[PDB]
């Protein structure tokens, strides 16, 4: 589903509030993108469905760390 593999972000539900304050249900979706991350530790490419915030987290932390916690969470990449 539309779940960021790294950050765990998933769609939420809010309202479209018009100018006249009419409220209709809507969904906020994360900005996911299927990206091919390169890992030095294996000499290999790892493809993850990760939002832009998740890619920023990847740059900040490191690909090895994020896979470490992905495996700890048990999700298969």
């Amino acid at each position: 589903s539309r779940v960021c593999q790294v950050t765990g972000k998933r769609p939420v539900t809010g309202n479209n509030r018009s100018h006249a304050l009419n409220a209709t249900k809507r969904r906020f979706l994360p900005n996911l993108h299927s990206h091919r991350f390169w890992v030095e530790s294996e000499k290999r490419f790892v493809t993850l469905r990760v939002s832009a915030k998740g890619m920023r987290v990847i740059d900040k932390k490191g690909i090895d760390t994020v896979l470490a916690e992905l495996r700890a969470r048990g999700e298969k990449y």
Binding site: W38, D59, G62
Partner: protein, 41 residues
Amino acid sequence: MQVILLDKVANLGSLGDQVNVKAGYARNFLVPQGKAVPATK
């Protein structure tokens, strides 16, 4: 983004220094082909 260079990339930088490069440039090109590593120290 800050990258520690590992080569002389004829565009801009010499070996072994931290330089401000575009995040996408570092993520897609520099890091995956040696050349640079992120500035974590």
